[PDB]
Every structure is written in structure tokens, then in C-alpha cells.
Design a protein around this ligand. Structure first.
Ligand SMILES: Nc1ncnc2c1ncn2[C@@H]1O[C@H](CSCC[C@H](N)C(=O)O)[C@@H](O)[C@H]1O
Ligand SMILES: Nc1ncnc2c1ncn2[C@@H]1O[C@H](CSCC[C@H](N)C(=O)O)[C@@H](O)[C@H]1O
Lengths: 248, 248
């Protein structure tokens, strides 16, 4: 009875999921729409989160309060950070983190601006549990959920399914030198704008979480946005959810 | 009666507020704690949001769902961006925005990294209203709430009270050239890590919102963190809330 929550930011990242639901009921609260239905006879809630960290955290929190899901799959599109990956490849998030969180040391105006000196600002991922502070430098994908997606790699026929680190920021980077620096510094597979924020809320509520992201683009190979990748990602995630459901 | 919601991120930014409440009870869900009580006999909820955009959005959303407040005051400490301002001055947020949101045009690796080319990525503040996309390049503080705070300026005993733009980011900037660039580009009064995120959720729920921030520090004048500013801000906010309550 507790539903599986499946998230996407954009319309193109959720409409295939929504079409797969049986006996759909729609709910909109604030800026956030949910479709409550079934897959393989089991309750599933699809959430259109809108874009970015604030939207992701709001949409996830609202879903926790309204639906009490048993697990969360956050999915959608991303941009490549690892040169080994191409448009259409899918990253299963071994961990996600707030890549956009920056703290910098004091420098006078004369020294200019140097982002290579900025440090990851981990307080942005700090939480409390029963009122006690718990530090986080990243959020691990639930390792069984991660393993399951990797084991199903053969069922995805539009690229490779690989484990990787998902870097979350309110950013779309197209300065290739910046992408390279972020990859070298944080070992990122891909960048996007929601995962670690949804993951933060899932950790606060102690609900298993996994991020699943297709590269819709990568400037490391001159590969521009292809909307079909979002559809292919949802097809894989439907299969994945159905497998989980067969298991329940 | 629908409560006034008053927010602060850190313990030092809420303990004075909490001490002011009568007939309290303390509620924690996930990572977020709320104190429900009364000020001047009127219901008030004090929220400890924890730090950063994801936490602010989660804490605000959770408060909307649990308490349905009639208005939101987000307050706490900030770092100066405007050279005219000093530690202890209070900024009333005429608007707040996601200063950390960055989009850049394509540049090849050989051109390196140039943050002066990172433009504000407005999609991070885009919402939906009854299913329809609504752009936001910032969130205006409720203008009557803003005006009221400005009208009470001479009731603040420890510095100026000024209107200004609040720049929200998962960042603590201490590169003075970077502070200067953000101020020149966005006309920011001060920087902090929650306001526009809480504001985004308040806009989605159509609940009046105002940000009230004291400068606890500014590297434009070599003024390091002073925790007493946080206490002073809360005293001003209590006075302000009591004024609204008298009005109800
Ligand atoms: N290269 C990239 N960098 C950052 N986010 C990316 C990305 N590629 C895809 N994304 C994801 O896709 C969305 C991009 S922002 C949305 C842009 C789109 N034109 C619109 O108006 O809706 C975000 O949800 C983000 O998580
Ligand atoms: N100069 C500044 N830049 C960004 N945020 C600032 C700031 N000065 C104060 N803040 C605010 O104060 C908090 C700083 S991060 C918290 C740091 C503190 N040492 C701790 O561990 O709890 C954030 O909530 C932020 O909104």
C-alpha cells in the first residue's frame, strides 16, 4: 500500500510515466502536480517537481506529507561531466551532492575572482535527526536500489547504464573548462538541478532514494539536447518500477 | 486563527523568538522543528529551517502543510553586499532572488572559466499556477509588509533599517571582488542562503512573505561575525509581529 514516488522536473520528463499509470487521480498543491495511480496493480505517485533545488525540495516534502511513499525514484535528464559518457547513457547515482554549494576564503578586491579556490559548502547538506545535527557531504543512493538498476542494464537499449556521481546545482554549465574542473575535482558523471535536494528530503524522512539520470546532452562531445532521451529514461524507469513491484 | 510563521535557520537565529512565545509545544518532523505558541495572545509558529535553499524550501513547505500560516516572516543574519551598509544594519527585502542560479553560453576548454559570463538562471524561480507556467526573476516582499517594517525603522535600537535586495545562494562569498561584482550586477544589499527559497514556496502557496535580515558580517568593512546581531534582529521582528497582531 505505500506508493513508490517517481519524480521528474519537466513535462517531457513525466508525461510517459503519467501515461503508464492506471486509474489516475490528479492533485495540485501550490506549484506542484501529482498523479496518483497504479503500475502492475501497485500504487505509484508521479510528481512533476519543476526545476531546481528549491522546487525539488518543496515537491519532495509535499509528497512525503501527502503520500508517505515507501521509496523515491528521482529521474530525468542531465549534462555529461565524464568524457567517457555520451548522450543517451544513463547514470545510476551511487551518490548525489550539492555541487553548487560554495564557500570561499577572504581575498581583497585586488586579487579578483577565482572559482578554483571555492570549497564545497557542506553545511547545505547538514540535517537534524531527532533534533541532533547530522553532517552529510553527499547522499548515497540506496545501494540495493542502485544495484537493481545496474542489474537491469541489459534491458535499456539506447545507451549504457553506469554507476556514477550526480552533481546537483542550480546551474547549467556550458563552459567546458568549468565542466572539466568540476569533473576533476568531484569525480562527477553528470550535472543536473534536483537530485541531491530531493535526496536531502528523502534522508530527512528516512525513505530509500535512488537517482536515475539520462544524459540528454554533453558539451564534452558536442552533443546537443535530444528530448527523446527523456522518454527513453522514463521507459527504463517504468520497467525498473515494475520489477520492484513484482518483488513486493 | 491562522498563525504568523517566523523562520530562522540557526539556533542563534530562533532562540530569542522561541523564548518570547507563551504556551509552547515543540514539533519535529523529519529534519525540521517548529515551536507553536502565542505572541500577544495570537498564534505564532517559529520554524528552525536549517541552512540553505533545499532546507528552506522543505521547512517552508512542511509549515504550509501543517500550519497553514496567514503570512511568513523569514529572518536571520546575512553578509553585506552594499558598501553603504554595516554589521547591525537590517535589510527589508523589497525583493529576493536566487543569486546562485547560473547559466552560461558554450565556451571551449581553451577559454578557461569566466564567472562574469554566468548569468542568472531564472528557470530556478519559475513556478506553475493552476497548471500554467509563471516566470519569476525575483520574489517581491509583500509591499505592505515591507512598508510596515520600514515605517518601524526608528524602533530598531541597533542600526539602520533599509529597503534592499536580498541575494540568496548556497554560498558564503568572501572574495571581495566577487561580492563587488554581485552587488554591481544585481544591486544586492546582502547575501544569505534561505530567503528566495522560502519566498518561492510562499509564492506557490500565495501566502504574503517578507524577508528581514540583519548584517552579522561584511567583508566590505572587515566586520567579522557578531552573534549579537541575530538576537537584535529577533527583537525587532518580535516588535514587528506584535504590531501586525495588534492590527488583526
Ligand atoms: N546540462 C545540464 N545542466 C544542468 N541541468 C540539466 C542539464 N541537462 C538537463 N538538465 C536538467 O533538465 C532541466 C534543465 S533547466 C530546464 C530548461 C528547459 N528549457 C525548460 O524551460 O523547461 C533541469 O531540471 C535539470 O535538472
Ligand atoms: N555572509 C553570508 N553569506 C551567506 N550566508 C550568510 C552570511 N552571513 C550569514 N549567513 C546566513 O547564516 C547561515 C550561514 S551558514 C551557517 C554557519 C554556521 N557556522 C553553522 O554551522 O550553523 C545561513 O543560514 C545564511 O543564510
Amino acid at each position: 500500500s505505500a506508493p513508490i514516488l517517481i519524480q521528474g522536473a519537466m513535462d517531457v520528463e513525466v508525461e510517459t510515466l503519467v501515461a503508464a499509470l492506471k486509474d489516475k487521480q490528479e492533485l495540485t498543491v501550490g506549484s506542484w502536480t501529482y498523479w496518483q495511480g497504479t503500475l502492475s496493480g501497485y500504487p505509484v505517485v508521479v510528481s512533476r517537481t519543476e526545476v531546481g533545488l528549491a522546487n525539488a525540495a518543496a515537491a519532495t516534502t509535499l509528497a512525503m506529507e501527502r503520500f508517505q511513499p515507501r521509496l523515491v525514484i528521482n529521474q530525468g535528464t542531465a549534462g555529461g561531466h565524464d568524457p567517457a559518457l555520451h548522450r543517451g547513457d544513463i547514470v545510476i547515482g551511487t551518490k548525489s551532492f550539492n555541487m553548487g554549494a560554495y564557500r570561499s576564503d577572504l581575498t581583497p578586491a585586488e586579487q579578483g575572482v577565482d572559482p578554483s579556490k571555492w570549497h564545497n559548502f557542506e553545511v547545505t547538506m547538514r540535517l537534524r535527526d531527532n533534533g541532533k545535527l547530522v553532517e552529510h557531504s553527499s547522499f548515497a543512493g540506496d545501494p540495493e536500489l542502485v544495484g537493481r538498476a545496474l542489474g537491469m542494464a541489459d534491458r535499456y537499449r539506447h545507451g549504457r547504464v553506469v554507476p556514477g556521481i550526480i552533481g546537483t546545482a542550480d546551474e547549467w554549465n556550458r563552459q567546458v573548462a568549468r565542466i572539466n574542473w568540476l569533473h576533476q575535482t568531484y569525480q562527477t558523471a553528470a550535472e543536473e538541478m534536483e537530485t541531491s535536494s530531493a535526496a536531502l528530503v528523502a534522508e530527512a524522512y528516512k525513505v530509500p532514494f535512488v537517482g536515475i539520470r539520462v544524459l540528454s546532452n554533453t558539451d564534452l562531445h558536442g552533443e546537443e539536447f535530444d528530448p527523446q532521451t527523456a522518454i527513453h529514461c522514463q521507459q527504463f524507469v517504468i520497467d525498473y518500477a515494475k520489477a520492484l513491484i513484482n518483488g513486493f
